[PDB]
Amino acid sequence: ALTRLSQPGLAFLKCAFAPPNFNTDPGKGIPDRFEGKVVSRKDVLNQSISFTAGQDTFILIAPTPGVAYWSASVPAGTFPTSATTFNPVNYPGFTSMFGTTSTSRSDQVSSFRYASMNVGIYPTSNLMQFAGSITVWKCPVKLSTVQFPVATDPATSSLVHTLVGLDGVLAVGPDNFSESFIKGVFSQSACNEPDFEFNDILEGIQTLPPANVSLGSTGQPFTMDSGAEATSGVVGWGNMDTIVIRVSAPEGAVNSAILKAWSCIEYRPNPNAMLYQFGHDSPPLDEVALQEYRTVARSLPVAVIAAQNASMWERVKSIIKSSLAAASN
Amino acid sequence: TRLSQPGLAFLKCAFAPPNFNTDPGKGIPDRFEGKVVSRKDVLNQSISFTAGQDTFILIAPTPGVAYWSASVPAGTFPTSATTFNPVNYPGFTSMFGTTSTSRSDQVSSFRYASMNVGIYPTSNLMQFAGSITVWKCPVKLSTVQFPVATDPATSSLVHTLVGLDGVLAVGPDNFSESFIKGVFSQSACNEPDFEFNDILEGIQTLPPANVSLGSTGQPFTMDSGAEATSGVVGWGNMDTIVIRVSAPEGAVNSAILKAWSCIEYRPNPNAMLYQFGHDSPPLDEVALQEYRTVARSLPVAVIAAQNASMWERVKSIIKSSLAAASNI
Amino acid sequence: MAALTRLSQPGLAFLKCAFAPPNFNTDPGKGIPDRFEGKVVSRKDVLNQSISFTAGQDTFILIAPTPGVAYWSASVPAGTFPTSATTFNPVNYPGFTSMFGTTSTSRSDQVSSFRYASMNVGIYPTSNLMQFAGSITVWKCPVKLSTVQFPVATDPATSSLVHTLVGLDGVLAVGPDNFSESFIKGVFSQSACNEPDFEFNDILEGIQTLPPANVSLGSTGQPFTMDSGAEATSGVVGWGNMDTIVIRVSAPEGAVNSAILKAWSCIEYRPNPNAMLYQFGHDSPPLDEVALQEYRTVARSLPVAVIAAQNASMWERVKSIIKSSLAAAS
Amino acid sequence: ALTRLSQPGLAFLKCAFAPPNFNTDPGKGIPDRFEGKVVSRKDVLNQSISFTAGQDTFILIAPTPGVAYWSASVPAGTFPTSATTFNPVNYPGFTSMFGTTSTSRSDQVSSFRYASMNVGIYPTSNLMQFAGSITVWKCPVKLSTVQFPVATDPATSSLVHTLVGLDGVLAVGPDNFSESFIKGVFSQSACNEPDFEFNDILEGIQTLPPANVSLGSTGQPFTMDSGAEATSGVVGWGNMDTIVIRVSAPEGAVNSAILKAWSCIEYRPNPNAMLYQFGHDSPPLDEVALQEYRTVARSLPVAVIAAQNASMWERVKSIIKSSLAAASN
Amino acid sequence: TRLSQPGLAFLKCAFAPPNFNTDPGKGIPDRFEGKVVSRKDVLNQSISFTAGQDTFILIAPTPGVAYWSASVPAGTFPTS
Amino acid sequence: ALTRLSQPGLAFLKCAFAPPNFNTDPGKGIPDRFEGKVVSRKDVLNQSISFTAGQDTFILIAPTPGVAYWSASVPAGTFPTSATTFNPVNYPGFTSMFGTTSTSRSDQVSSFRYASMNVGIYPTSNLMQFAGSITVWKCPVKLSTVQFPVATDPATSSLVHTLVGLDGVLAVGPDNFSESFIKGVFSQSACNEPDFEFNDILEGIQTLPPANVSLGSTGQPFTMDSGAEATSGVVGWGNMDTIVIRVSAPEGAVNSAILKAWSCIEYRPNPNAMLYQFGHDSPPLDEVALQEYRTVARSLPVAVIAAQNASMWERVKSIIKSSLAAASN
RNA sequence: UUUCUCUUUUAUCUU
RNA sequence: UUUCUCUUUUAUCUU
RNA sequence: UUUCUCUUUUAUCUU
RNA sequence: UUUCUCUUUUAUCUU
Ligand SMILES: [Ca+2]
Ligand SMILES: [Ca+2]
Ligand SMILES: [Ca+2]
Ligand SMILES: [Ca+2]
Numbered sequence A, D, F: 001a002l003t004r005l006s007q008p009g010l011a012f013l014k015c016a017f018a019p020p021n022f023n024t025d026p027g028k029g030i031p032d033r034f035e036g037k038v039v040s041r042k043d044v045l046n047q048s049i050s051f052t053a054g055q056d057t058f059i060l061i062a063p064t065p066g067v068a069y070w071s072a073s074v075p076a077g078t079f080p081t082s083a084t085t086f087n088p089v090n091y092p093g094f095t096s097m098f099g100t101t102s103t104s105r106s107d108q109v110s111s112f113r114y115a116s117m118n119v120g121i122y123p124t125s126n127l128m129q130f131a132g133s134i135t136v137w138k139c140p141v142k143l144s145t146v147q148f149p150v151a152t153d154p155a156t157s158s159l160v161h162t163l164v165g166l167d168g169v170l171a172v173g174p175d176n177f178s179e180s181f182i183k184g185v186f187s188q189s190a191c192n193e194p195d196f197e198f199n200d201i202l203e204g205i206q207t208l209p210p211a212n213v214s215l216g217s218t219g220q221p222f223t224m225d226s227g228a229e230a231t232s233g234v235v236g237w238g239n240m241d242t243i244v245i246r247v248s249a250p251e252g253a254v255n256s257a258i259l260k261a262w263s264c265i266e267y268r269p270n271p272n273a274m275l276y277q278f279g280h281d282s283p284p285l286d287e288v289a290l291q292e293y294r295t296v297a298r299s300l301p302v303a304v305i306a307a308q309n310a311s312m313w314e315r316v317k318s319i320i321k322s323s324l325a326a327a328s329n
Numbered sequence B: 001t002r003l004s005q006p007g008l009a010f011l012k013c014a015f016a017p018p019n020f021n022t023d024p025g026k027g028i029p030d031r032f033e034g035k036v037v038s039r040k041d042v043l044n045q046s047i048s049f050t051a052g053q054d055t056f057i058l059i060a061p062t063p064g065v066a067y068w069s070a071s072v073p074a075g076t077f078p079t080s081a082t083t084f085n086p087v088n089y090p091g092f093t094s095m096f097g098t099t100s101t102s103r104s105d106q107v108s109s110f111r112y113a114s115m116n117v118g119i120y121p122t123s124n125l126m127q128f129a130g131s132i133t134v135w136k137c138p139v140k141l142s143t144v145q146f147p148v149a150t151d152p153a154t155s156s157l158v159h160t161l162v163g164l165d166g167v168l169a170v171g172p173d174n175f176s177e178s179f180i181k182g183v184f185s186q187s188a189c190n191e192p193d194f195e196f197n198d199i200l201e202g203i204q205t206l207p208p209a210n211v212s213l214g215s216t217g218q219p220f221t222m223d224s225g226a227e228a229t230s231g232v233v234g235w236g237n238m239d240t241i242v243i244r245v246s247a248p249e250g251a252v253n254s255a256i257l258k259a260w261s262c263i264e265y266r267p268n269p270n271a272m273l274y275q276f277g278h279d280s281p282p283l284d285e286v287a288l289q290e291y292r293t294v295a296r297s298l299p300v301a302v303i304a305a306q307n308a309s310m311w312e313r314v315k316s317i318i319k320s321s322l323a324a325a326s327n328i
Numbered sequence C: 001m002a003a004l005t006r007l008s009q010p011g012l013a014f015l016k017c018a019f020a021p022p023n024f025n026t027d028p029g030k031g032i033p034d035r036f037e038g039k040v041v042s043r044k045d046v047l048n049q050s051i052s053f054t055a056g057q058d059t060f061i062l063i064a065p066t067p068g069v070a071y072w073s074a075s076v077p078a079g080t081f082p083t084s085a086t087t088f089n090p091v092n093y094p095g096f097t098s099m100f101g102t103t104s105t106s107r108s109d110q111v112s113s114f115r116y117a118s119m120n121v122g123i124y125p126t127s128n129l130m131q132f133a134g135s136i137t138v139w140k141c142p143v144k145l146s147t148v149q150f151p152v153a154t155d156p157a158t159s160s161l162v163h164t165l166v167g168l169d170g171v172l173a174v175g176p177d178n179f180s181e182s183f184i185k186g187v188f189s190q191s192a193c194n195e196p197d198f199e200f201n202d203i204l205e206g207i208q209t210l211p212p213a214n215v216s217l218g219s220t221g222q223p224f225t226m227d228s229g230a231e232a233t234s235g236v237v238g239w240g241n242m243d244t245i246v247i248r249v250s251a252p253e254g255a256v257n258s259a260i261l262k263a264w265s266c267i268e269y270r271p272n273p274n275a276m277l278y279q280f281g282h283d284s285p286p287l288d289e290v291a292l293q294e295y296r297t298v299a300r301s302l303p304v305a306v307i308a309a310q311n312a313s314m315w316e317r318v319k320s321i322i323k324s325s326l327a328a329a330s
Numbered sequence E: 001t002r003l004s005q006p007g008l009a010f011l012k013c014a015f016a017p018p019n020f021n022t023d024p025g026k027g028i029p030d031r032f033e034g035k036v037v038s039r040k041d042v043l044n045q046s047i048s049f050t051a052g053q054d055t056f057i058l059i060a061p062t063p064g065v066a067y068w069s070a071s072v073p074a075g076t077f078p079t080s
Numbered sequence G, H, I, J: 001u002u003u004c005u006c007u008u009u010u011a012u013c014u015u
């Protein structure tokens, strides 16, 4: 049954829903209509992380290139406020691709498009000290713009990047996974568009709201700060929903874990880049894989405990064969 | 092959005439199948047209706002001296707040499936006079880049509507008929696919505050008013319908106007909207090609009487096109 | 053949305007065989220009998907590439103004949005065998039109956002995937949609230079500058979804390099009801699965560029790649 | 496959797109509905020609009977102006058919209709001295009329022959062939009507605008002067587009060549003419040939280099068999 | 046999009623296949007819001119 | 016969002596004892170049990572003098690997080792204007050090990088290839050590002699200037002899060409680099390939004309089979 | 671009 | 205008 | 790490 | 200029 899929079409589905803990081929690309030259980037992060007691730590798997996630900590039982600021954590070699200045992101590559975005939280802590829960839901966060006037001389109108849908982080979504901390968790996001459009690399973005822009004007409920332009930054915004994770650590609880992040991204490389050497045409269209991708995604749970992560690939193959069969009637 | 339930519903909300208890359907049978909330916006507006005036109505793919209306002296078109004002769909505020920075509080993005409009004359036959003329415009929301002599010197970039110049003349492809005969017309996706558009914050006027209409290139103005009552939350990929009601001097032109919109929004987990969301309908190749074929085959607009047999006209175009394909 | 019979009439025309020389193809073709079937106006822009290259200078040309401008050129010192000090200047296709007016704010008067189908270019040397010298190198860059965000110390202090050309840097190095041959052998090369689908792009208002007026090249990241000149003669009306063809013509000193330059552009526009253009419109041709798949395949199968001599073999060369892949399916 | 064509139907297609350098049968006529008596005239010119340096020489293959082409020279980088005058070059024996006075053209024949109109430019010059290019495009030039008043006594209204579509010569058509001079060129024109209508022979035409007629009144962008009525003249205007050729010779360039012109024309002969002796009925209708003619014509390039001229006939047969085959489905 | 795309479009521009987003079609499906430009001319004219007058309108095959209008006293026809 | 070589062992020999004009696999690595993780970098340059008349232009294919070659021009009939300075030309994406400051070269990679170094010069110029010759020889240039005292306070002793064997560029080596310019040339260099040792990446090197160092102290006959630290630099010195090319262009000669450069390099990647994603173990030892490598190298000519470049691979296979056969006795 | 064998040599899919 | 053979004798189409 | 088939799917070597 | 078939397609010579 899984023989109706082209080689890449299958590979594609594995990067998408499978956890390549093994050094599996990073990617073969996306089996969609596009077949121009791209570079399959397999971003993976392994961050050991300790959650502070009495704090409800928030993590955002936000489809920003090179930066695995963003996290902020808030007093237990509460959510981010205007007073909150999220700080990015990068994937290995951020600078090796986007440079060290807010105006050199498009040096290596010009555009991109995500294929997968997975995350897992495995628990370090012993069974006597842990406590608390891990809650997950996904937000349709897009990167729009805000228009407002400014009393300068002459008076003028401003336009800047603003994040819409952030207000979704201020409450636990109805469609969510919630369970004991110790059980860990695995979850992934998918393309929030009817197709895989290429997005441009964005220059100069270090903070949202921008420098000199008040938060109130933006609409955004809180702030995104990538920090020094030489260490991190916002190079773009993919068409993937953002995964939200709330790890609430009660008082005196010793909750530690290891967090892993996966990201299959097709970048359009520049000839002057060395990166270009590893370019290859995108895999040619695989109608079946593209239809299964959608079906599988819609079928899977918001998230699952860490243990069920291994059977994840197996869980996926059954949904496919079950879909390919129920469609042979 | 045949259409799915959602794929058929999709075609009904799309071309279905008003009255049919049309089902919003599960939404768009297009490759996307993520979480969405289907809203079927409907407006019923009693309205009287100023005699000796040529009133211009615009159905444009802005969420929450049915149409935009401006009026000018009979025989003329909008001028730089003209400003169009929104009329809201019921509950605009309950969706996009009361601040120009509250639009994306409930939903983050959207995509139009249909955008219909109908005008049913209520005038008694002698009293009424005039015509109704319709044509559609490919109005897109772009941007304009101009420098500004501030200190230090800077360059501005702001929203600007392109293709508005098409409203200053009656498009060759148009429907023209006696006012009394009413009218029904619909718009459709002006893109090959139904991609999602983002919700836009801060937009109240175009040209925006502190920008001269000269800077934008726009032929006239768009004013939504108090940010507490209305505003421009986004611009969808649908051609904009233009309606000219020509009321001569001493003409009593009264009528009802209905606005239909089928929109798929991406709900924010925090919104009270979310509990009504489901997943966008899985791809229905048939529907997606029927949609396109029907759209192209349908007239710009029709009189109100032909609207009733409109659905039947659609099933007619469905079988004829489907029959040729089945034969091979 | 069975392949040729499967293709819808517009679908065939589409492929020709895309991969084949204009002289071979009288037709533009109706338009793009994709799902979109709304009202459009197919224009096939063709520039013919006798050009002579500056001896002792490398001239760089860019076939960049901006409507109604054929290409952008600039010459630099032999052996070097564009620098911050360099500025590229457009050459228009015939009747630029008749399409996009004469002021930087009247670009969207005739049409509102657009989408490219094909974008070819060819150089036919006209020098005798006692005067020609030098090389013609060609590669393509994925140049997209994005934006840059940066704060400004005005009163009050504000944050700017302007247009920036991303991936322009690729023009400063000849990528491993390239065509390079003696000048005399001329060259032919086309570009194709760098997106999975042909979506429409808006017409851009007020753009005359990039970086724009009052902006330092430094704050944009762009390696060099783009200047369309007087708003009354040219300008940047938009940026299509096609990779940009880069061309480096090196002329040694004392060399007479003359040639003819041709440029094709199959573009589908969204006509404004008021435009005098509109009366020539028609509906975009309906979807042709086959043609769209052949397009992709052929596109990826063709070489970066080819010498002018085997350019005629091109149409026939393509007809081969179509029947070779349409062989695997059945 | 090429056996579905009648003998003449094939012949017809050869005269049309083939270069009978060989003394091939001149013609068998046109396989259209008409079958009355005609005379198949195979006009052929062999003119050695040297292009002056710094001049962009313009040649017009204009479907005027007996006159191969018309040429004028303009300063390089420029086009004909109101100040330009084109002078005809005749095909052998012009006078032997149209006489020696502007009012004796219809003496031999009364009407006509073109079948083919081909032209080729082969290059004399060595590879060290040549330079420049040959550009080609075709213009829909028809022969209409202009109506204007004249202040005579009594005042009256004039009506005279005027050429419409000449403005097409003032710019290089978008559909054109352009290439290095040395590569030569071959191109042909075809019937610009849905059928082969007969045109009358025109008496008294020596210049356009006529004698006593100002150029401005005509609309014509430049002038056509056939010269002495005893040596040349305009005897008619066929339903063929006119082939335009711009040979631009840079400064110091030594560009010479040999130009050849072909023209298959069916003339209606007069009994009192000796010419009549060689009359024969037009070939009876050959639906296939008439449909192929159209297909082939539409398929062929504007023009091709001289070298590809030999394979021209072969190029044509493949288009036919390819059309006859793709139509057997 | 059945009609071609252009041949069908041809029949639509020919008899198609106004409103149908009629496609100019590629033009005339007639033996000729040379270069042409298809133009679909459309005029929308608001007009009032003089009372006691018999207004005469002429649609005539002149490019660029929709119609020709003259008016005469009711019950009569054009005169020199 | 060529089946006694492992897959990589063969590949290895192709990168070494074959011109992958085709996008052949860049590399599989070096079949030597080492099997740790490396990244096979296939550096390739395509530089159009015009040689000035009356000048004897000198090009050095010097096994410095990221920089294809270095060239200087001297008055015809002469060689570099103390007054000469060579300027590097980079391979695409220099900065994308070694950064933009003289102290960030070891950011991406830590060490390296060359496998191949090939160069070819193909001629643009016509046969009437060219003149002159291309001369080639190879120099055993190593990167050593110089020790000298400096009268500072307190007085101290300096030690800096100095290039030994540069004096080999001041005369045409006895073992050389010399031939008419128009004939072009192809030549390659090989490992100048009994094994493939890894060399470290060198920080801070922009010029040799260094800044503040007089040329006389160094011993070096001329100067090496990589220019702005943000555009180029000397990141290391491989164990390959340097290829020297002297293109002497007489007065009035119009000599142009296209120069190509190949370089197979195994770099030891850093985990924090994205570059690392494309790492793989070095191919395991292939005694045969390593012995053939040596034999082939020793056999081949200094250089050959451009035309014989295509048969180069074939020329190589025959030497191998001829060696594998003459060794079966 | 015309053609197969052979070993390759990876890479999945299945027991 | 009623009919074939025969050589003609050109003329293409195909290997 | 225990085992084969199968199609893969690239990749060379040979005619 | 190297070679035949095939239909041609005219054109005579003969019943
Ligand atoms: Ca908000
Ligand atoms: Ca899209
Ligand atoms: Ca405008
Ligand atoms: Ca940059």
Ligand SMILES: [Ca+2]
Pocket: D167, D219, D220, D221
């Ligand atoms: Ca005129």
Ligand SMILES: [Ca+2]
Pocket: F167, F219, F220, F221
């Ligand atoms: Ca020394």
Ligand SMILES: [Cl-]
Pocket: C048, C049, C050, D172
């Ligand atoms: Cl020109």
